[PDB]
Amino acid sequence: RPVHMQFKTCLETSTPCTFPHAHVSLTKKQQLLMVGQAYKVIVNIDMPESPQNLELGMFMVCAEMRDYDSMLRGHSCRSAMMRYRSPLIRMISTWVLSPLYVLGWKEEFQQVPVEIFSRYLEERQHPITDVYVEIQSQKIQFYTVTLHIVADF
Amino acid sequence: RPVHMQFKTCLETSTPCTFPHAHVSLTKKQQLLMVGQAYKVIVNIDMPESPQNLELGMFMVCAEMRDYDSMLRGHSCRSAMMRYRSPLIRMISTWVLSPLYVLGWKEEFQQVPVEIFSRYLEERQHPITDVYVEIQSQKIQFYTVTLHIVADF
């Protein structure tokens, strides 16, 4: 339920120098409420129906857990893929819901949530401050990336 | 709310010599009102639906913070991308709103705001005068670039 906004830096080139780069995170009160109540975290990426985005297919995403002592406490790489639609059903959804997309009320993108972890930050002594996120691709196009440390056991 | 207009110099060639170049900024009273009241800054780029602009996709943008002592106090590179539209919905928005674009009332461009910072200029002793902006591309086409040191905590 508390949203968390991140500036995924796209590796100073369109060409794949390394990978996208991340880890801005500081909610210490929600860090403690995650540990004491066994909450979890989920990332959510907003990406359009670009032809480069539709040619992408499956991609990996990965996240880390570095504590207040900057020690790596958790590491999980996750699989992800857009919700595939046929071009016929994209044309039909275009023609049917046309005045919505004309008035800019739906915006031809998809929210792709990727569940990263299920439990808390491994101990009460040194919980996790930032999360080193990277997407294992370079042809991906997206609008924004948002974590969600949800209040869910 | 105070607007700030910048002359982004396009690197003396259409070919990528280096990168676009920037940093004209002088509002010392608004500099002090940013520091004393924890304001933030956001850039906004006006770019058309050119075929070179639509082929561009994601690009990085980056900004610096050099103070009255000309010391680099802050540095943030940011991700950006146009709001993607399908060619079907561009044709439908063309045919529906046609007399607006004929009379030159909407102008087939997009304003893309990119939030750069969230807080003030790092101290009251030597706040930031100019902002070294660069766009990490050379195929980008735009009309103008405008910062907004908004009065927002």
Swiss-Prot record, chains A, B:
Reported tissue expression: Widely expressed, with highest levels detected in fat body, moderate levels detected in salivary gland, midgut and muscle, and weak expression detected in brain.
Domain of life, per lineage: Eukaryota
Stretches assigned to the Lumenal side: 1-153
Disrupted gene: phenotype observed: Flies are viable and fertile with no noticeable behavior defects, but display reduced average weight. The size of the lipid droplets in larval fat bodies and the fat cells of young adults is significantly reduced, but exhibit ectopic lipid droplets in salivary gland and gut. Flies also display greatly reduced total glyceride levels and hypersensitivity to starvation.
Compartment list: Endoplasmic reticulum membrane; Lipid droplet
Chain's role: Acts as a tissue-autonomous lipid modulator, preventing ectopic lipid accumulation in salivary gland (a non-adipose tissue) and in promoting lipid storage in fat tissue. Required for the growth and maturation of small nascent lipid droplets (LDs) into larger mature LDs.
Protein name, UniProt field: Seipin
Gene (UniProt): Seipin
Residues included from the entire protein: 88 to 240 of 370
